Structure 1
Amino acid sequence: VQGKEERNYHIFYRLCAGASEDIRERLHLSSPDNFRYLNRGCTRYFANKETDKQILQNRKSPEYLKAGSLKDPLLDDHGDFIRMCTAMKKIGLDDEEKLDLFRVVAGVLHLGNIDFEEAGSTSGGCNLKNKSTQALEYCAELLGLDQDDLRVSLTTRVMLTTAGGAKGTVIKVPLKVEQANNARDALAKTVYSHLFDHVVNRVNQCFPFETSSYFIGVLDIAGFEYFEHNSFEQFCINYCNEKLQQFFNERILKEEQELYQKEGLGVNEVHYVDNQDCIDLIEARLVGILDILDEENRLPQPSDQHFTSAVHQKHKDHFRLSIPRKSKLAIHRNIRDDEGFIIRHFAGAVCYETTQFVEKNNDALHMSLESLICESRDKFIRELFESSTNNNKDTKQKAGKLSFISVGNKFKTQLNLLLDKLRSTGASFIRCIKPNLKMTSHHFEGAQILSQLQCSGMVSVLDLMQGGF
C-alpha cells in the first residue's frame, strides 16, 4: 500500500519499464495501471532524453500518457534495467538463475489483483470474484501453485480437532471478506521479504570470508524523513532514528567521561539529554502507542478512529504528546481530534494523521496459506522460504497455537536485534549535509542547510557539550 505520489520499490518499475518483448512474453507483463500494487501511488518512470524515445507504447499507463517520464539526472528506469543485468553478470549469478530471479518478481505483480466478494450465505464465508478467475490462473504458474488448491487456501482457515480421544480430523472454517483482503496482501509481504534475503545471501557467497573475530562495519540507513503529511512508513523511521539518537548521545557523554579524567582536566557532570519519556511514550508495554496498535489488530472489528481516542486515553499525561489541533504550525490545525496526534522527537514536533494507520499495520498470514507457499511446485522457489543450508530452522506444520501472530511488534523486535549488537561495539558517527536542492556545483542554501542541522541530531550534541575547553 503505496501513499499518494509515492512509488513501490524500484524493481517493480524497472521491470515494467525495461522489459523487452522477448522478456514480456515469458512473464506476461502489462502497463502499471493494471496492477493494484502499482496504481495506488504514482505510475511514472524515471528517464533521460535518450531513453525517453525507447519506452514502448504498451508499457505506458494513462498517467504516463498525461505527464510523461519523470526528470532526474541519474535515475533511468528503462536504461538501468540494462545496466542491472551487466552487474548481475559481474556479481556471481548465471543467466538461467537470473531468469528465475525475474519469475518470482513477476509472480508478486499478478498477485496484486485478486478480489473477494461475500458468499451467497451458503453457511457463511467469502468467495472469489468473477473478474478474479483469469487473474488467479495467470498468478499460480508464477508462484508454482495449483489453481484448485489455491482457491481453498485463500478463503479458509484450516485447523484440526486431533488432540485426544475420539475420531480426530481437519475441519475448514472460512474467513471474512476483510480478513481475506488483509491475508492476500500478507502473502506479498512474505514472498518479496524472503526474495531480498536470497539476493543478499547470494551476494555474501560471491566473495566469502576466510574466518571471523573482530569487525569494522558501516551502518547506513534512512535519515529523519519527515514530509508535509506523515505516514505509517514515517512512524517507524522516526521511531528508529529516536533509538539511534538514544545510543548516539550515550556515546558522546561516555567519550567526555573517558577524556577529562584521562587527560586530567578535573571532574564534572551534566544534565543528560534523556529521551526515556519519549521512548516509553512510543513503545512502552501495555501503555505505549505501538503497544496499543498491535493490540488493536486483535479486536473483533478494526477501526482507525477507535485507535486514536485510545492513544489520548492511555497517554493523558506525557508532555511530548498533544492533540493535532494544538499544532505550532498552522497546516495541521485542519485535522480533528480522533484523526491524528503530535509527538515531539529529537528533531522537533512531527504530527502524524491516523487515517488508514491501522489498515496498513494489520498483516496476518494464516496456517492454510503459510503452509501452501512453503509447499510450492517449482524448485528454485522452495529453497527461498527455507530450511536453509546452514542454521536450519525446520518449522513443522503440525502445531497449534498461535494463528495470526504479532506484526506491530516485528518492526521494533527486529530493530532490537541491531541496537543491542551496536551496544557491544564502538561508534564512528559521520553526518552528511546536503548543501543545495538541485545537487548543483558551487551552490549553497542557508534555507536548506539549517533545517538539516536541526533534524540530524546535531543540535542535541551542542546542547550537551558545555565543557568550556
Structure 2
Amino acid sequence: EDGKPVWAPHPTDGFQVGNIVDIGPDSLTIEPLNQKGKTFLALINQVFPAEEDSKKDVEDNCSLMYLNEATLLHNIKVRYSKDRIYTYVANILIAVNPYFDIPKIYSSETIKSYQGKSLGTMPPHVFAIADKAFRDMKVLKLSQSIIVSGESGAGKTENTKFVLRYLTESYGTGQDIDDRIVEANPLLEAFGNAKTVRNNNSSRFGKFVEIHFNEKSSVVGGFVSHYLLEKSRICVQGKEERNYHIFYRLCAGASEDIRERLHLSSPDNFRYLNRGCTRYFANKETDKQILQNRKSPEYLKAGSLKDPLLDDHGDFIRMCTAMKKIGLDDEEKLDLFRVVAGVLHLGNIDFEEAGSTSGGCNLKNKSTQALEYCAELLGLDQDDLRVSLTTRVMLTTTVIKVPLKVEQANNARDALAKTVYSHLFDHVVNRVNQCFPFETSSYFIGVLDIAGFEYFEHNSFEQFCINYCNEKLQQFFNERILKEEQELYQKEGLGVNEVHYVDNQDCIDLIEARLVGILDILDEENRLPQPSDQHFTSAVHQKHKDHFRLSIPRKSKLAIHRNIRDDEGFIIRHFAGAVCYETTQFVEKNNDALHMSLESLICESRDKFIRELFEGKLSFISVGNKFKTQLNLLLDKLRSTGASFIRCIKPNLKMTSHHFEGAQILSQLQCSGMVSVLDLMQGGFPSRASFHELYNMYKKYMPDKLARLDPRLFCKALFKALGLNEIDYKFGLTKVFFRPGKFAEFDQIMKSDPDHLAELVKRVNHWLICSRWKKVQWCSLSVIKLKNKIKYRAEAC
C-alpha cells in the first residue's frame, strides 16, 4: 500500500527500509528511508513488504504479519543484540553462533527447567529440541534424528555437544559416552577433515553419531557411522586446497626416531601432496618447532598458514594424546602410520610404454628405488607388485597375464590408494566403536552432521557430490515440513486443505537417472576405448537438450562463467540457485580401475594389520554408482525415523564476537533452504497468533465492555463482529490462522474508525450475552459430568 514501508536491497546490509516513489512495468523506483535522495531502482521480485512495528522481535516467526526472508533477516538482527541466539521457525531451529559463552544457558538448572515442558511455551533453546525428540520417540514408538547443516565455524560442532549433554543428564542416568566423541575429535580432524577454498577445517563425510535407547528408556550405548568420502582428494587436489589433514600432521609432527622408520620426506616430493597446497597451519611458537627437513620450498617462500585454532604440529600431539585415551597402544599407533606412509610412496610410481613385445606398459627406471621403499610398507614383493600394476590376470579354464594400457595403469595405481585409504578410515571408525561397545539396541536418537551447500567460483567434482547430497536432503526437508503442517491444521481442528508442493525430482533425474543422467553418462565414458571430457560435455546437452535446470555457460550473467567454452563446463540449477561446474578432469577424477589382479594382491599381504583392513566380473566396476548407492542407504534411513532440523548460521567472516554481516547471513538463508520453506508456507496459513497475543495487541482499540472479556471470547466476539471471510481467516483451538497479508489487513481494520467499530460491537451484543451464558452453563455441566465420571468409574472397581 501506499505509503507503507517495504524492504529495499542494500548491498552492505542485505535489506534496509525504503519507500516507492515511482514505478514501471518491471521496476520500482526505491527511495531509502534513512538515506533520502539516494533513490535507486529495483525489480518486482527484489522487494518485500515490511511490518509497521519493526522495533520488536518474535521468538516464533509465525507471529509476523509479513513472513518473508527480509523480515526473518531483521528478526535475527534485533535478536543478535539482545543475545537471543536461538529462533523458532515451526519444526526448524535457527541457531546463530556468538563466539562467546552466554551465562546460565548451559546450566544444569536450566536443563531441568526445560525437562517435560510443553513446546513453544518455553524460550527457544537447543534443549527444547532434545526434550521434544525424546517425547516424540517413546510416545510415537519410532526412532529420531537430529539434522545439523551449515558451513564451518557456524557452531555445528558446539550444537552437537549440547544434544549429547542433554541426553546423558536429563534422561540418561549414568553412561559417560557423551565426551568419548569429543575426546577422539582430533582423530577425525586428521583423517576426515580437510581444507577447502572457503573453509580451513571442513568435514568431508556424513557423521552419524547414534545414541541407543532401550524399552525401559535408558541409554544403553552409542555408535558412530560414516558415509561418503572424497575419493579424488586422496590423490589429486585443486588449487590451493589440501589433501586430508593426517597427510600434513604426520609430516609436521613426526620425530626423527619415527622418520627413520617411515622414511618420510618433505611434501614437495610426494605427488599426492604437491598438486595442491603443501603449507602447514601453525602459530609463531610452533613455527620454531617444525624441523628444517619437513619444510617444502612453498613453506620456505610463503610460511605457515594462519588460523586461530588449527596447528598441524601441535594438534599432532593432541591427536596422540587422544589415541592414548581412546584405546590405542604405541605399536598399534605406529601401524596407523605405516599405512599412511605407504600411500605417499605409491603416488610417485610412473608408467611408460612397453617396447613392442607384448603390448602394454612398464614402470619407469626412475621409479625403481621408489618401489623398493614402498613394498616393505605394504608387505608385498616388488616383482609380484610390478606384474599386478601392469597386467589383467584371467583364466582360460591356464591363468594368463594380459597387459594394460598406460592410462589404465595410472588410474589403477591411484585406485589402490583410493581403496587402501578408504578402508583405513573405516578401520579407524570401527576401532573407535570398539572402545565403547553398545550393551543392546532398540530405539535410537542420532545426530547427522554434514557440510551444507558449499560452492566456489569454479566448482569441482568434489563439490558436485556435496550439492547433489544437499539436493536429496532438501527433498526430504520439504517433505517433513509439509507433513508437520498437515497435522497442525488437523490438531487445531481446521481440517484438511489444499496446498501446493514444489518438486525437485526433475533436478534429481537430470543428475542420476538411468542411461540419461549426468552420472550415468560419466560412468559410460570410462567404458569407451578412448575417454574424453569434450565428449562428456557434448553428451549432456545431447540427451538433455531442453530443460530449465541446465544451460550453457555463456547464458550466465557472470563474466567469469561467460569465459568458459561450451565443451568446458555446464550450469545446473539447484535449490540454492545456478551453480556452474567445469568439466576438465571430471572423468579423470571419476575413473577408478581397481581390478582383480590388484584387489586380490593387497588382500593377500604378508602384513597382518593390512589383511585386517580388508575384512570375476566386474573389471572396472561402476564408480559413478557408488556415490548414488551409498547415499540411498542414508536417505531411506532418514525416511524411517523422525526429524529435528537444526540450521547453523555463521554471522561474520572473521568469526569474532558481536559482529553482524547481512550480506553473508542472507546468503546462508538462501543456501540453507530456509527461503524455500518460507515459499512453501505461503501456500498454507503462514501467519498465526495465539488468543493471548491478539488480546495484548488489540485491547486498547476496543470498547471497555469488550475489553473485560477473556482472550478466547474476546477473539470470538471480534471475529463474529467483523464478519470475516471463512477461507481467508480461520478460528483454531489455541490460535487464529491467517492467509498471506491478512494479519496485516486485520491490523488495519483495528486502526480504522473508532465509531464504526463501536457500532459493530453494539450489533453483536445479544449474541455476546448468549455466548457468555452458555460458557458458564456448559462449564458447570462439565464439572457435573466429571463428577458422574468419578462415580461411574468407581462403580467398576
TM-score for the superposition, normalised by structure 1: 0.95
CA contact (8 A) 1:251 1:427 kept: yes
Q: CA deviation at 1:262?
A: 2.1
RMSD: 0.9
Residue 216 of structure 1 aligns to a residue whose secondary structure is strand
CA contact (8 A) 1:281 1:318 kept: no
Query: Structure 1, residues 273-320: CA drift from partner, whole Å, max 9, x if none?
Result: 100111111111111111111111111111100000000000012111
1:467–1:341 CA distance, 2 compared to 1 (3 A):
closer
Q: CA deviation at 1:466?
A: 1.8
CA contact (8 A) 2:500 2:683 kept: no
Residue 387 of structure 2 aligns to a residue whose secondary structure is helix
Moved over 2 A (4+): none
Query: Structure 1, residues 254-275: CA drift from partner, whole Å, max 9, x if none?
Result: 0001110122124322210100
| CA distance in structure 2 between the partners assigned to 1:290 and 1:197 by the alignment | 25
Query: Structure 1, residues 59-99: CA drift from partner, whole Å, max 9, x if none?
Result: 01111110000000000001110110000000111111111
Query: Structure 1, residues 375-402: CA drift from partner, whole Å, max 9, x if none?
Result: 011111111111xxxxxxxxxxxxx222
Residue 338 of structure 1 aligns to a residue whose secondary structure is coil
| CA distance in structure 2 between the partners assigned to 1:249 and 1:260 by the alignment | 17
| CA distance in structure 1 between the partners assigned to 2:525 and 2:675 by the alignment | 36
| CA distance in structure 1 between the partners assigned to 2:582 and 2:382 by the alignment | 40
Q: Which has the larger radius of gyration?
A: 2
User: 1:63 maps to what in 2?
Assistant: 298
CA contact (8 A) 1:224 1:456 kept: yes
User: 1:393 maps to what in 2?
Assistant: none
Q: CA deviation at 1:328?
A: 2.6
| CA distance in structure 1 between the partners assigned to 2:267 and 2:509 by the alignment | 42
CA contact (8 A) 1:365 1:404 kept: yes
User: 2:46 maps to what in 1?
Assistant: none
CA contact (8 A) 1:324 1:333 kept: yes
TM-score for the superposition, normalised by structure 2: 0.56
1:467–1:180 CA distance, 2 compared to 1 (3 A):
closer
CA contact (8 A) 2:651 2:661 kept: yes
Instruction: Percent identity, please.
Output: 100
Query: Structure 1, residues 432-452: CA drift from partner, whole Å, max 9, x if none?
Result: 000000111111111211111
Match of 1:419 among 620, 626, 635: 635
CA contact (8 A) 1:6 1:42 kept: yes
| CA distance in structure 1 between the partners assigned to 2:609 and 2:495 by the alignment | 65
CA contact (8 A) 2:283 2:311 kept: yes
Q: CA deviation at 1:467?
A: 6.0
Match of 2:558 among 329, 332, 337: 329
CA contact (8 A) 2:279 2:304 kept: yes
Query: Structure 1, residues 347-375: CA drift from partner, whole Å, max 9, x if none?
Result: 00000011111111000101110000000
CA contact (8 A) 1:16 1:59 kept: yes
Query: Structure 1, residues 181-213: CA drift from partner, whole Å, max 9, x if none?
Result: 000000000000111111101111111111001
Query: Structure 1, residues 124-155: CA drift from partner, whole Å, max 9, x if none?
Result: 11100000000000100111110111111111
Structure showing greater relative contact order (alpha-carbon pairs closer than 8 Å, 6 or more residues apart): 2
Q: CA deviation at 1:330?
A: 2.2
| CA distance in structure 2 between the partners assigned to 1:11 and 1:454 by the alignment | 34
CA contact (8 A) 2:499 2:683 kept: no
CA contact (8 A) 2:341 2:377 kept: yes
- Mark the runs of 5 or more structure 2 residues left unpaired by the alignment: 1-235, 685-797
| CA distance in structure 1 between the partners assigned to 2:365 and 2:252 by the alignment | 30
Q: CA deviation at 1:329?
A: 2.0
Residue 33 of structure 1 aligns to a residue whose secondary structure is coil
| CA distance in structure 1 between the partners assigned to 2:557 and 2:522 by the alignment | 26
| CA distance in structure 1 between the partners assigned to 2:410 and 2:336 by the alignment | 27
Match of 1:382 among 611, 614, 619: 611
| CA distance in structure 2 between the partners assigned to 1:84 and 1:461 by the alignment | 41
Residue 158 of structure 1 aligns to a residue whose secondary structure is strand
Query: Structure 1, residues 12-70: CA drift from partner, whole Å, max 9, x if none?
Result: 00011111111101100000000000000000000111101111110011111100000
Match of 1:124 among 353, 359, 364: 359
| CA distance in structure 2 between the partners assigned to 1:68 and 1:294 by the alignment | 41
Query: Structure 1, residues 153-178: CA drift from partner, whole Å, max 9, x if none?
Result: 1111000011xxxxxx0011100000
User: 1:248 maps to what in 2?
Assistant: 477
1:467–1:345 CA distance, 2 compared to 1 (3 A):
closer
Residue 394 of structure 2 aligns to a residue whose secondary structure is strand
User: 1:13 maps to what in 2?
Assistant: 248
CA contact (8 A) 1:47 1:70 kept: yes
| CA distance in structure 1 between the partners assigned to 2:448 and 2:590 by the alignment | 26
Q: CA deviation at 1:222?
A: 1.1
CA contact (8 A) 1:324 1:341 kept: yes
| CA distance in structure 1 between the partners assigned to 2:586 and 2:323 by the alignment | 38
CA contact (8 A) 2:391 2:404 kept: yes
Query: Structure 1, residues 332-358: CA drift from partner, whole Å, max 9, x if none?
Result: 000011111000000000000111111
| CA distance in structure 1 between the partners assigned to 2:641 and 2:495 by the alignment | 28
| CA distance in structure 1 between the partners assigned to 2:682 and 2:360 by the alignment | 66
When structure 1 is superposed on structure 2, of 441-450 and 31-40 the one drifting more is: 441-450
